Design a protein around this ligand. Structure first.
Ligand SMILES: O=C(O)CNC(=O)C(=O)O
Ligand SMILES: [Mg+2]
Ligand code: NI
Ligand SMILES: [Zn+2]
Length: 331
């Protein structure tokens, strides 16, 4: 078995290997990358996502989210308070202000220490989940707006034609902005490209050990667990590396820098934080190996998780027994 310790792997494809996206994902899996839940892909030196980032300041963040924490430093939840619209240029200036800017630090490890110590005492503002793309239309390799769609994959594998579309999302971050512990909708893959700015630190649990994380989460968030049998679908709970180590949960960590791709694999729980002002782009995707994970994915039916239009068909076709209850949660 390849990669039996479930380490995060880093790949350096050549420009020739960067042509065929599906083939390279299958190659990474042949080397055991998926066992970690997360992989890093450094593009060939010849590639670029677009020519410059000089003209992005007029993009609108219609609903910036202030991430307010409750709990203790290593075990907390966050809720998202909606703020007034602002442009990317206005958000960048806010991120660089004395109130929100990254503090002085020695290295990534020192910054990680400061994040875990101090996150809860601040409420950073996240420009998350903005439909759109920063890939130039002429970028032909690993262009996250030109991938094969999940609906076309289901159709190719299973023969059933379904409604829905699959488009990317932009994330404009600042120091301490946080992504809570989650897997993707329907336990899909995700791919994330860091276009510009300061790094993003990730934590991940191997897919084969995901239920260990879920059992800890039910212990640490006992009211939430009573409310919903899949409450990590709410995307609000944080647990620190120190707490994970104290409870014997297998995980790994890695820092993504500008110009790098990360791939999350089906049922790989992940969480993390931004180091400073940055912009990422991400989208979900599927492969043939996903189908069995999609059929087994947990679902939130309590009403909190509320998701996209396109998840309807995935539930309806892959999980017809769950469909009626899940749909009530959506309505
Ligand atoms: O970058 C973020 O805030 C969150 N990203 C992801 O969870 C992802 O790409 O799967
Ligand atoms: Mg602009
Ligand atoms: Ni994700
Ligand atoms: Zn729920």
């Amino acid at each position: 078995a390849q990669n039996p310790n479930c380490n995060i792997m880093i790949f350096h494809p050549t420009k020739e290997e960067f042509n065929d996206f599906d083939k390279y994902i299958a190659y990474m899996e042949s080397q055991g990358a998926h066992r970690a839940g997360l992989a890093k892909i450094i593009p060939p030196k010849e590639w670029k996502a677009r020519e410059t980032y000089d003209n992005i300041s007029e993009i609108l963040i219609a609903t910036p989210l202030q991430q307010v924490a409750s709990g203790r430093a290593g075990v907390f939840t966050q809720y998202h308070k909606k703020k007034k619209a602002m442009t990317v240029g206005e958000y960048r200036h806010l991120a660089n202000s004395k109130k929100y800017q990254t503090p002085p630090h020695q290295n990534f490890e020192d910054l990680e220490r400061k994040y875990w110590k101090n996150r809860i005492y601040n409420s950073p503002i996240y420009g998350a989940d903005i439909s759109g793309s920063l890939f130039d239309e002429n970028t032909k390799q690993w262009n996250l707006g030109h991938l094969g769609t999940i609906q076309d994959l289901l159709e190719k594998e299973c023969g059933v034609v379904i409604e829905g579309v699959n488009t990317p999302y932009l994330y404009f971050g600042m120091w301490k902005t946080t992504f809570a512990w989650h897997t993707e909708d329907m336990d899909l893959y995700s791919i994330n490209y860091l276009h510009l700015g300061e790094p993003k630190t990730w934590y991940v649990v191997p897919p084969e050990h995901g239920q260990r994380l879920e059992r800890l989460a039910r212990e640490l968030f006992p009211g939430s667990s009573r409310g919903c049998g899949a409450f990590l679908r709410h995307k609000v709970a944080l647990i620190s590396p120190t707490v994970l180590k104290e409870n014997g949960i297998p995980f790994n960590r890695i820092t993504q820098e500008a110009g790098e791709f990360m791939v999350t694999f089906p049922y790989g729980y992940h969480a993390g934080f931004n180091h400073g002002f940055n912009c990422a782009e991400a989208i979900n995707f599927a492969t043939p190996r996903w189908i069995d994970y999609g059929k087994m994915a947990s679902q939130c039916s309590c009403g909190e998780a509320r998701v996209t239009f396109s998840m309807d068909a995935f539930v309806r076709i892959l999980q017809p027994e769950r469909y009626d209850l899940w749909k009530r949660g959506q309505d």
